[PDB]
Amino acid sequence: VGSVAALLTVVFYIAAVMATNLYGATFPEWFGDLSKSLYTLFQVMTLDSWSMGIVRPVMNVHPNAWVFFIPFIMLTTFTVLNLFIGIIVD
Amino acid sequence: VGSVAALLTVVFYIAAVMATNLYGATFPEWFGDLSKSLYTLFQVMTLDSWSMGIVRPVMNVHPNAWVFFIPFIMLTTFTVLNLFIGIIVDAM
Amino acid sequence: VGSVAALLTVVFYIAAVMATNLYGATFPEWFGDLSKSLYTLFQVMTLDSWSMGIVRPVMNVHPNAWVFFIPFIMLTTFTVLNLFIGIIVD
Amino acid sequence: VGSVAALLTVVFYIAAVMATNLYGATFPEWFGDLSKSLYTLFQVMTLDSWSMGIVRPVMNVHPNAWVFFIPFIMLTTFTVLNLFIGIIVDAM
Ligand code: NA
Ligand code: NA
């Protein structure tokens, strides 16, 4: 359970280190520094306006941005569910 | 489990083949080619602005578009949940 | 399981018969007829722009509209989850 | 089960007492009184436009507003899921 959380935080930090680098210069209010990234990736992970509000405007400059966001969503949303179930079982 | 994923990908491809054909010419930014469709249907499956952002504008041109999106939502959202639970069970 | 679905459809029809009557004349594109209502209540049940997009503009004319939408959300979202789990178990 | 609901209502009231105080004067339509707060925190708990619609505009005046909303989300969303599962188990 704590092991699941450990994976998720490593993933969340690596995702935010990558996101800062990729879309930081072009989208500063969303990924203009590691912290700005960690917030936006938490927002993306919750699915609040992930596509219409973030990923589509991102794709208008970086057309393949989907190769990073969609897998990230698939991976982080599975982990969160897995974790939340793990606490409930334990 | 892998069988559940196999169903979902077939559904996802058939849904995107259908969606391209139906609302492609009228809504090119959303379904203007199989890939554009696969992205928008993933977005619809996650429920991000499915109605206010996609389905309602689509219905303003195709008033019965709901006969395709609502069942798709019902089917894909059930499958994803069923799949995610299936992995969790098959690990215990 | 089929019993759960039966409850939900009765609730969904009564909710749409009530919604048509309450906010139909004031918000025709959302509840201007039983079918328009059934669509918007499905949208509300999925939580797509339920508050910012629907319930807040509804409350600007009917300030207590929350006494209908919030319980409806609580009830329908519980039922859907209960149903989806029921199919998975059976 | 009823104990889980009891925790959530205490949390929900304390969160709305805090939220009223913090962002009430600056964002009156959202937290301008305990009731306005309880509605917006329910909306945040459901995740409807939590960030783009609420938290980001809030952060433009209070840059650390995230220290309150993100933990609240983490805590309330876990509780609701835990509660909904608890009813389902206590019926079997
Ligand atoms: Na949403
Ligand atoms: Na959601």
Residue A62 backbone class (left: φ over 0; alpha: ψ -120 to 50; beta: rest): beta
Question: Which run of H or E residues covers position B29?
Answer: helix B28-31
Nearest to B39 among A66, A81, A85 (CB): A66
The answer to whether residues A23 and A62 touch, using CB atoms and an 8 Å cutoff, is yes
The answer to whether residues B37 and B31 touch, using CB atoms and an 8 Å cutoff, is yes
Instruction: Tell me the C-alpha distance between A69 and A84, whole Å.
Output: 22
Q: Supply angle C-alpha D65, A18, B36, rounded to 5.
A: 95
Instruction: Tell me the C-alpha distance between D23 and D3, whole Å.
Output: 30
Sign, CA torsion D49/D50/D53/D56? negative
The answer to whether residues A46 and D73 touch, using CB atoms and an 8 Å cutoff, is yes
- Radius of gyration, alpha carbons of chain B: 14
Q: What DSSP letter does each residue of C9-49 carry, written as one string?
A: HHHHHHHHHHHHHHHTTT-HHHHSSHHHHHHHHHHHHHTTT
Instruction: Tell me the C-alpha distance between B39 and B45, whole Å.
Output: 10
- Chain C CB contacts of D48 below 8 Å: 47-52
CB contact under 8 A, A73 and B46: yes
The answer to whether residues A29 and A17 touch, using CB atoms and an 8 Å cutoff, is no
Q: B50: which 2 tokens?
A: 């499915």
Alpha-carbon gap: B12 to the closest alpha carbon of chain A (Å): 15
CATH of the domain spanning B1-92: 1.10.287.70
The answer to whether residues C68 and C18 touch, using CB atoms and an 8 Å cutoff, is yes
The answer to whether residues B14 and B72 touch, using CB atoms and an 8 Å cutoff, is no
* d(CA C47, ligand 1 centre) in Å: 6
Nearest to C49 among B49, B70, B81 (CB): B49
Q: How far is residue B69 from each of residues B72, B91, D48, measured CA to CA in Å?
A: 5, 33, 20
Q: Supply angle C-alpha B15, B20, B22, rounded to 5.
A: 90
Residue C20 backbone class (left: φ over 0; alpha: ψ -120 to 50; beta: rest): alpha
Looking at this protein, which amino acid is placed at residue D34?
Answer: L
CATH of the domain spanning A1-90: 1.10.287.70
Q: Which residues contact D87 (CB under 8 A, 6 or more apart)?
A: C78, D1
Three-state SS sequence of chain A: CHHHHHHHHHHHHHHHHHHHHHHCCCCHHHHCCHHHHHHHHHHHHHCCCHHHHHHHHHHCCCCCCHHHHHHHHHHHHHHHHHHHHHHHHC
Instruction: Tell me the C-alpha distance between D92 and D89, whole Å.
Output: 5
Residue with tokens 């098959």: B90
Q: Which residues contact A72 (CB under 8 A, 6 or more apart)?
A: A15, A41, A44, A45
Experimentally, how was this structure solved? X-ray
Query: Would you call B59 exposed, middle or buried from its count of C-beta atoms within 10 A (0-12, 13-18, 19+)?
Result: middle
Q: D61: which 2 tokens?
A: 């005046």
